[PDB]
Design a binder for this molecule. Structure first.
Ligand SMILES: OC[C@H]1O[C@@H](O)[C@H](O)[C@@H](O)[C@@H]1O
Ligand SMILES: OC[C@H]1O[C@@H](O)[C@H](O)[C@@H](O)[C@@H]1O
Ligand SMILES: [Mg+2]
Ligand SMILES: [Mg+2]
Lengths: 729, 732
């Protein structure tokens, strides 16, 4: 009530002009020249800033607040998605570590670095469920599984916000994108999402609720329609669900120009009506389009909105600012005015140990023919491909304040790891695409992709000549980070054709071929699975990616990472995901649910990933065959390292309700342990199962466990498991 | 109440054993040997038969009924989808005619032929909305548009059932598949369907309701889940919607083994519980698995079901049998006991005139560089490809009693059309697929696909040598009918790789290249659009396909057919459909990077909805609305003048689309709301007048309120969904 008292008496001091000013979130750009923005801050007409990311620059803004009547401090936000200055792997890569503590360490250090530069808030975590590999932004999520994405959503929020949001090394988590954004039709970004309420509540919503339950201070609203209604004008989503049902008590933030876009959605004929829909639906804070400042006064004058609409939004902004401690000290994350200046991008402000150690855990070994990996640090190694010496790509999309020049490439990683003991030979081999239209797209806003001016044939001859000089080729191939961005939807999930032509040429030299993959989404790797001697999935592995990849290639680390998203054989099988419904005619037969013109199932399933050692599980044992209401069951299995090398695997518990009021999925992830074992080491794993893990949203959204059979699965991926059954009473 | 009285007094006479017997629908096969089935009919334990399709064979069954106590007649059903013995184009092809009377003529003659053979019912029309070209069964539907599929659903039902269901040349329409079956995830057949109730009511359901409103005597229930609940156990779908809300008064029929499959759906641990869910959800008649006969007695004994559950289903079966006139004369479609025997597949029992005249209307001219088509009947024409001399494929999937041997191939069609005036040279050029696994699948039960024992290279050399001898190549390519069947879902929408290798070789000879396409779904034709000199979409055009294709190729007919389903550039763009939502960041075909689009391919469809070329040129005058305000209960007039401004007689389809740019839901960028197909002679002009009222402006909102909101409405008019002009009015 200290906070309630403080807020109530500040808002009793405030005019509607000052209140509406608090709802305005802007960045320096064409729409808002720097100096007219500073003038707006001095006049009490700006609530917050995004995309201003250095102490001197953020100090300069907060300094303008003393000129306003009430001196209400700004908060400063940025897209700290998977690192601020020290870049960790893209979220899809982090998820692949299957280790909350690893994911937490990336968020803690992100918060530490961003706070240290003056930032109060990150538009993070992105926790949208993704079953469509075509979608540009799958790189920003944690994959396709509801349980894993929901858990890591909670982990990220608690790591960022820490023990106290006032703390100088804590930032506010603004979870995104609320809601259902990953389910765009055709995987086209911003596009229509349409689904049943049972699927919505069971599969897609839980990650947002986890962020709320973990204490997320903010929620960012999505650009997409939900069953005909844009989320930004969806009163049901933002008021009935978010506030009245989940009990969210924080700040709602519009997406970039999302209020104005209600016109193109066909929900409003003009900006006046677009504003009314958004504030009355439950959008507090308006990003960039400034429709709130332009129209909220006139809507109130004409009775089209209530004072309570303005007050709800303003109180939310002030409560956020309060919990960040900005009313106690606006400069608590900006040092002291007499502090000596520093180089923001100084080497000593980075966390390279952390980045390298996190980057190792998420690398996924997909293929290793006749123990080719790990490599010895001897002989001549050809390092070939357009992503081998790429600093821009290895830090991935949404790379915040990450500096390309400070990033360790895959080539450099190998250079450092072999020293003078092996000879590395380099050849680019191909451009990332051989299609000038795709190169035009990738280089459209910024020059993201360095184009060799030579012919494909010239580059291939040079690559072939390098392979011939070498004992083995390490091909570094896949996507440029510009291919797994916002709006970068693909019709083709394969490696680009220029690089596939390179890989076939390289295969034909007869040299052992190791594939180091870079990608922000599941790829189509039919050919690579038949032909490559080994494949390593490195996603975009960040600032210290090259070192972490070199550590795994030379056996300093044993690949432990496993997929959190199913890899389709082709884009034609989209969507494919492990927790699908059985249907009345499950494919194992001509008259089953399947394609005829391709092998069925995914190439690599959910939970899949190889190691340099071999693991075994003892028989699955349940503590009983009946479970009483309010009692707790124990699934017990013994994991061994039955190979020669130390290493980690992930023991995954799945669950099936084979008889239910709805057709339930064939299995759903409900627990896991990542376990490091020395050779011969054994760990008894014990899973606790209760009524909470058996529940689902029925036809009428009743969240219920029904009595009857439950099947418990345990294995090292969703494909290779054993089941044992019990009964709920 | 004559019927109600009759039924009430029959059912008062009946035991539960006799009532449960009426719910049993079976076919002769492994599961039911012919003679044990006849014994079951005599014992009053069979309600109906499917897949028995000749008079002598159907007579033999109905003869067994006199041995039952109450002598309740059987009805006999079959899959008369697009013809019985004389096969018309696949439904997707029929839709492309944009002509109710053409679609009606195919259904009338289907009913006539099937009734003439003894059949009472067809599991038809299939009226499932299809936005996913990967799905095997898009060939059986009318495309992606709700308005067109809803209209043709009504047309098909009224054609089949005629003026009286008692009539000897009328059959009962059993509309399918209720419901949402075309929206399977991944386009994998039988697979999960999951959608909002606004999309369901606005886009997907109306065709089923049209069948009901047209007086469909029966509805067949789908195999797919709807939002977690199999349609077969979906009480909401079959009771609350179908009966209580739409007022359906006919018979519900399960799909093949659909009750038992509730176990694999994970809705039931056993057959006892699977039966209870299905009969209590509102499934009257049980197809093949016989769970109803095995379990309904014990469920009733133990109180797990009510007598009213049994009675509802039985009364429905009897009402269907009554309206077919089978209680007045079980042999009314089986002739008289004296009647002389005949050859069922006699040439004189076919309707070749009708099939040829219907097949012309749906052929779609996609490309015609420098008026190559129509061809003259002179010189040397190379006819190359694996579908050129294919009889089995041209009759398509769900070909009922259609005989391959009786079908006119594309080669034969051209042979008849040129007689002795031109030289046709033949070469197969490639096998339908070059993948032995796909050939194994296609030839798995029956040999559907003739594999040439020569090498691809040998066939290519022979094809190339034929092209060299010729003035122009007519390449006959696309899918085998086994590729657009039930469960034949594809990951690739292109022409098979063996035929694409053939087309590239042929292109490289420099000879004019005409593509005759055969397919049961939208194909990916990026390459063919850049490289072929002309493209003709022939779908599967049926028994008289070859003749109808030859008529269009030689200008006897002017291509009038237009697409009812959007053609994607690649499978990676699935789904693509004209009536999509704008989104908050629409791409402007002034491209932006941050719009709703793919980056690694051209965006939009290759060919849009309503698209199709002609041998002549048409013009439209400016669109004129009768006013700029429309009063509640009043009627607006959109008026345009269509001309033949070219040298040949021919038809086009003038299409009216509608947009509600401001609404409580984001509405589609446009929705089809009317059309005229118009034949014009050169220089001929016709003032077209569309009537628009409040009914055409309505939509299902967040809470399924079906209303027109006041405000702006935009009217579009053009010869396809791409190339239109708009004018606005206001509702008050
Ligand atoms: O710049 C901040 C925001 O910009 C928007 O364009 C994106 O949709 C958000 O996800 C992002 O966090
Ligand atoms: O063969 C009769 C019926 O069998 C079902 O399995 C099919 O799905 C229906 O379309 C068909 O009409
Ligand atoms: Mg149960
Ligand atoms: Mg309106």
């Amino acid at each position: 009530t200290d906070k309630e008292r403080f807020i109530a008496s500040l808002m009793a001091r405030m005019s509607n002009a000052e209140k509406i000013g608090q709802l305005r979130l802007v960045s320096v750009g064409a729409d808002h020249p720097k100096e007219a923005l500073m003038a707006d801050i001095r006049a009490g007409k700006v609530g917050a800033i995004f995309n201003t990311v250095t102490r001197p620059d953020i100090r300069a803004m907060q300094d303008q607040v003393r000129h306003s009547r009430l001196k209400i401090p700004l908060f400063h936000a940025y897209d700290v998605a998977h690192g601020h200055r020290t870049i960790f792997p893209i979220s899809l890569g982090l998820a692949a570590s299957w280790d909350p503590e690893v994911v937490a360490r990336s968020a803690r250090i992100s918060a530490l670095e961003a706070s240290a530069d003056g930032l109060d808030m990150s538009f993070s975590p992105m926790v949208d469920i993704t079953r469509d590999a075509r979608w540009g932004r799958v790189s920003e999520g944690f994959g396709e599984d509801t349980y894993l994405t929901s858990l890591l959503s909670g982990v990220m929020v608690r790591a960022y916000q820490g023990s106290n949001l006032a703390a100088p090394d804590s930032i506010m988590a603004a979870v995104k994108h609320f809601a259902l954004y990953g389910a765009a039709e055709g995987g086209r970004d911003y596009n229509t999402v349409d689904m049943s309420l049972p699927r919505m509540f069971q599969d897609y919503l839980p990650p947002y609720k986890a962020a709320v339950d973990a204490g997320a201070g903010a929620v960012m609203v999505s650009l997409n329609t939900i069953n005909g209604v844009p989320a930004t004008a969806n009163r049901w989503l933002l008021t009935d669900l978010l506030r009245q049902q989940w009990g969210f008590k924080g700040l709602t933030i519009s997406n970039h120009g999302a209020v104005k876009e209600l016109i193109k959605h066909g929900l409003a004929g003009n900006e006046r009506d677009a504003t009314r829909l958004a504030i009355q639906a439950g959008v507090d804070m308006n990003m960039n389009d400034d429709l709130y400042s332009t129209w909220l006064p006139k809507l109130l004058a004409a009775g089209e909105i209530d004072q309570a609409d303005i007050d709800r939004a303003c109180r939310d902004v002030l409560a956020a600012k309060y919990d960040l401690g900005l009313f106690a000290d606006p400069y608590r994350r900006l040092g002291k005015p007499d502090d000596p200046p520093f180089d923001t991008n100084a080497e000593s402000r980075l966390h390279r140990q952390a980045a390298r150690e996190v980057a190792r855990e998420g690398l996924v070994l997909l293929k290793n023919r006749d123990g080719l990996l790990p490599l010895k640090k001897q002989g001549r190694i050809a390092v070939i491909g357009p992503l081998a010496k790429s600093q821009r790509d290895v830090i991935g999309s949404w790379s915040a304040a990450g500096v390309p020049r400070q990033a360790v490439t895959v080539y450099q990683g190998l250079a450092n790891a072999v020293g003078e003991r092996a000879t590395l030979l380099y050849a680019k081999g191909a451009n990332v695409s051989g299609d000038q239209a795709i190169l035009d797209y990738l280089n459209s806003y910024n020059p993201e992709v360095e184009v060799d001016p030579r012919s494909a044939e010239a580059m291939l001859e040079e690559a072939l000549r390098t392979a011939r000089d070498a004992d083995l080729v390490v091909a570094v191939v896949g996507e440029s980070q510009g291919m797994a961005h916002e709006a970068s939807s693909r019709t083709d999930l394969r490696i680009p054709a220029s690089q596939r032509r390179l890989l076939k040429a390289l295969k034909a030299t007869g040299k052992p071929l190791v594939l180091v993959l870079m990608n922000g989404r599941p790829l189509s790797l039919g050919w690579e699975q038949e032909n490559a001697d080994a494949i390593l999935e490195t996603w975009f592995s960040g600032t210290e990616g090259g070192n972490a990849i070199a550590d795994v290639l030379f056996g300093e680390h044993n690949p432990s990472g496993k997929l959190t998203m199913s890899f389709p054989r082709s884009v034609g099988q989209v969507p494919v995901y492990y927790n699908h419904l059985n249907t009345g005619r499950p494919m194992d037969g001509k008259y089953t649910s399947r394609y005829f013109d391709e092998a069925n199932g995914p190439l690599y399933p959910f939970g899949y990933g190889l190691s340099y050692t071999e693991f075994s599980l003892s028989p699955l044992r349940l503590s009983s065959e009946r479970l009483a209401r309010g009692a707790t069951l124990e699934a017990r299995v013994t994991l061994s390292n039955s190979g020669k090398r130390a290493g980690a695997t992930v023991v995954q518990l799945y669950l099936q309700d084979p008889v239910a009021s709805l057709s339930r999925p064939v299995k759903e992830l409900r627990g896991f342990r990542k376990v490091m074992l020395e050779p011969g080491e054994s760990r008894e794993i014990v899973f606790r199962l209760g009524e909470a893990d058996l529940k689902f949203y029925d036809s009428q959204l009743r969240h219920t466990a029904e009595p009857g059979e439950f099947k418990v699965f345990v294995g090292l991926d969703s494909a290779q498991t054993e089941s044992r059954s019990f009964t709920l009473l």
